[PDB]
Design a protein around this ligand. Structure first.
Ligand SMILES: NC(=O)C1=CN([C@@H]2O[C@H](COP(=O)(O)OP(=O)(O)OC[C@H]3O[C@@H](n4cnc5c(N)ncnc54)[C@H](O)[C@@H]3O)[C@@H](O)[C@H]2O)C=CC1
Ligand SMILES: Cc1cc2nc3c(=O)[nH]c(=O)nc-3n(C[C@H](O)[C@H](O)[C@H](O)COP(=O)(O)O)c2cc1C
Ligand code: SF4
Ligand code: FES
Lengths: 217, 433, 62
């Protein structure tokens, strides 16, 4: 589908260069640590980590934060604009407290991700582009979060919830809005990508060090 | 009896990723108990030439999906230094639909990846290793960071790595939601704080790479098997699989199977054996199977008549007008709308294009619109050949292989299910008068 | 409208070489000015220079 969000910034009272943003001293220490991970003369390599840290501190990315990152890294603001508008994990508009991302790619689609999307829709009463009136949940559609084996799966604030049934995701939503912390992972009684059939492989105890080592080493 | 003709049924002791399911301690102590970091100092002291020779004898091909010979590719960094530093880049972006192996390698066997990074960096003379992992894998990246900290404290990496006298650093760099950033040149751009747009080759990363320095980009699975290959030797790895298809492989089986899972199996195992052995078989029985995408969304699908006798290696699947890819098996039964699935894949490719070059940027969106119309049946039969020609134009005329990965599924669908498209068009024409 | 009184305002001749034009002008008795042909100089293009380790040729965007 066509991307709803625009790629031109128009100043608003909520979002304009005079919007107050700054990094906390702990965040400045983290920025120093991040910058020391690249060779001298290549400070611009830290644009993505520092921008992500700004988003993690603020929740989203106002243009003031992007200008601040450009100023800290001595990078022209247009390059930071390019980075922020290229990568989809950056939020250039405010999002809810829990950003719900449902994978609808073909491997997840085959395992009825439509049921999960509809269950979330009828539990929250919002669409796949809206935010709840209490500003708690934002629901969007994403592409292949990397857990195709555990389809259908959903990501909520860098946490994975997979092997989902509509009732399971509704319960997760209830305990999320109740202030609890839901345990990330599959909900079907399997811990990880192992087969649910009974662990067809890797049954024997793992071999000790140097077991298969060749001679002359 | 030399020259094996039947492949598969791999034993546990021959497996490399002995903690694929996270059933053991992923920390340093568990990895050491499982054979990791064992006389790796002796491996480093053997010199880059010995490691490169072992990798070449192993016959390892790139596990990222292209199947390039790992030894020949790594030998490109065996040049004398010209004043610039040398770097190793580990590709952990893992963008293909259907692929889940690198996530498990990172989350459950991180010390394997760290030791492979050290061994490969010593082999190619790299000063440090940058691990580029997708930003969706936050817990996986934090586990990797914990493992790297454990290795640093134990003296396994850093100054005087493992007592070998070779200095090596391991860095973790997180991207922000970009499937194109898995391509090696696009990944290099993403590391340097720029847009994830691929670079034209030449120059190759061995000449001009990250920060303009000689660089090698290698998949997580390719890196994580090198220490075990060097420990047991090239010959042991070589025996498994067909000739030029050596070693073990990680397989992700999803879609319409009873037990979708990630399993480790020998290379040339037949697809039917793998599906009925580890995945629990096709939902509704084997006779209910309609089509299989063997190597992730970039590889063309094959119908049931091909899946019952095909082998899961590069050459066999190439002979089947498809590719091994990332060994990501997606299974669809006869209840599946085959056109809708390919349309969803094309939508994925339309949303993942970086837009740098004309053929991908416009043609992929054009094919997305055409296939969206195809799903409803609004088009005409000549548009099938039109779409085939459009795909041909996109293929081989783009900067990177994302255009290839968008074109190939369309070609496979047109090749194997043209009557379905024609029938849907005829139904639309009837119903809409 | 735009008016003119010189009959030669639209006359343009094409020649394969400078000497042919000079000879035509001389035999027709016209005073001429000749300007030497300008050719763009050959240039050193290198795609790898966009990504230099230490030089200023490194690009900030693509
Ligand atoms: N694991 C994953 O998440 C994904 C994997 N893929 C796979 O990636 C494949 C295409 O990737 P490409 O890099 O475009 O294939 P490629 O053949 O062009 O390159 C593969 C590796 O070999 C090197 N290489 C190739 N030719 C070389 C040469 N003549 N000289 C020196 N080095 C050379 C390349 O630098 C690269 O590192 C696809 O077949 C796809 O299956 C695609 C998307 C995602
Ligand atoms: C669009 C695109 C995306 C890719 N994404 C990945 C990826 O996420 N992970 C990966 O290992 N390789 C990916 N690749 C293939 C890389 O080129 C490959 O991993 C790299 O050359 C490493 O080579 P190797 O297989 O010898 O390790 C991608 C290729 C393309 C064209
Ligand atoms: S083929 Fe697509 S993704 Fe690759 S460089 Fe061209 S526009 Fe970008
Ligand atoms: S298809 Fe859902 S995680 Fe990839």
């Amino acid at each position: 589908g066509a991307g709803g969000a625009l790629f031109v910034h128009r100043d608003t009272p909520e979002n304009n260069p005079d919007t107050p943003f700054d990094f906390t001293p702990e965040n400045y220490k983290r920025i120093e640590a991040i910058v020391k991970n690249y060779p001298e003369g290549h400070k611009a390599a830290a644009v993505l980590p520092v921008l992500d840290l700004a988003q993690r501190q603020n929740g989203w990315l106002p243009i003031s934060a992007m200008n601040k990152v450009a100023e800290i890294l001595q990078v022209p603001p247009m390059r930071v604009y390019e980075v922020a508008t290229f990568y989809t994990m950056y939020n250039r508009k405010p999002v809810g407290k829990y950003h719900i991302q449902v994978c609808t790619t073909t491997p997840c689609m085959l395992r009825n991700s439509d049921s999960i999307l509809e269950a979330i829709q009828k539990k929250l009463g919002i669409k796949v582009g809206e935010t709840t009136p209490d500003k708690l949940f934002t629901l969007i559609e994403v592409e292949c979060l990397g857990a195709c084996v555990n389809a259908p799966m959903v990501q909520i604030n860098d946490n994975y919830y997979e092997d989902l049934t509509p009732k399971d995701i509704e319960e997760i939503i209830d305990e999320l809005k109740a202030g609890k912390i839901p345990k990330p992972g599959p909900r079907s009684g399997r811990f990880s990508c192992e087969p649910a059939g009974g662990l067809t492989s890797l049954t024997e105890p793992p071999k000790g060090p140097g077991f298969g080592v060749q001679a002359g080493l | 009896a030399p020259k094996k003709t039947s492949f598969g049924s791999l034993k546990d002791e021959d497996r490399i990723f002995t903690n694929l399911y996270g059933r053991h301690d992923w920390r340093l102590k568990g990895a050491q108990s499982r054979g990791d970091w064992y006389k790796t100092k002796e491996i480093l002291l053997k010199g880059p030439d010995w490691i490169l020779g072992e990798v070449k004898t192993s016959g390892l091909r790139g596990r990222g999906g292209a199947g390039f010979p790992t030894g020949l590719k790594w030998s490109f960094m065996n040049k004398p230094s010209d004043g610039r530093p040398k770097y190793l880049v580990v590709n952990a972006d893992e963008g293909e639909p259907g692929t889940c192996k690198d996530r498990e390698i990172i989350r459950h066997d991180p010390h394997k990846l760290v030791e492979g990074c050290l061994v490969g960096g010593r082999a190619m003379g790299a000063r440090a290793a940058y691990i580029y992992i997708r930003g969706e894998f936050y817990n996986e990246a934090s586990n990797l960071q914990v493992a790297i900290r454990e290795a640093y404290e134990a003296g396994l990496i850093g100054k005087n790595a493992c007592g070998s006298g070779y200095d090596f650093d391991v860095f973790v760099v997180r991207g922000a939601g970009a499937y194109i950033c898995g391509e090696e040149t696009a990944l290099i751009e993403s590391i340097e704080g720029k847009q994830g747009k691929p670079r034209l080759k030449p120059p190759f990363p061995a000449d001009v790479g990250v920060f303009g320095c000689p660089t090698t980009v290698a998949n997580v699975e390719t890196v994580a098997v090198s220490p075990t290959i060097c420990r047991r030797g090239g010959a042991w790895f070589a025996s498994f699989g067909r000739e030029r298809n050596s070693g073990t492989k990680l397989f992700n089986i999803s879609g319409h199977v009873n037990h979708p899972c990630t399993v480790e199996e020998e290379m040339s195992v037949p697809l039917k054996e793998l599906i009925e052995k580890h995945a629990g078989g096709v939902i509704g029985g084997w006779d209910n199977l309609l089509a299989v995408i063997p190597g992730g969304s970039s590889t063309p699908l094959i119908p049931k008549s091909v899946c019952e006798t095909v082998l899961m290696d590069f050459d066999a699947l190439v002979q089947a007008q498809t590719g091994l890819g990332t060994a990501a098996v997606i299974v669809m039964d006869r209840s599946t709308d085959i056109v809708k699935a390919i349309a969803r894949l094309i939508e994925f490719y339309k949303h993942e294009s970086c837009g740098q070059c004309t053929p991908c940027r416009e043609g992929v969106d054009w094919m997305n619109k055409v296939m969206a119309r195809f799903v409803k049946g609004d088009a005409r039969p000549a548009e099938i050949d039109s779409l085939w020609e459009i795909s041909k134009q996109i293929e081989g005329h783009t900067i990177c292989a994302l255009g290839d990965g968008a074109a190939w599924p369309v070609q496979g669908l047109i090749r194997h299910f043209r009557p379905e498209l024609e029938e849907r068009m005829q139904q639309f024409a009837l119903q809409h008068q | 409208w735009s008016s003119t009184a010189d009959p030669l305002s639209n006359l343009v001749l094409t020649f394969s070489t400078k000497e042919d034009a000079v000879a035509f002008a001389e035999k027709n008795g016209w005073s001429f000015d000749v300007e030497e042909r300008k050719v763009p100089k050959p240039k050193s293009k290198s795609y790898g220079a966009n990504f230099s380790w230490n030089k200023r040729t490194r690009v900030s965007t693509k």
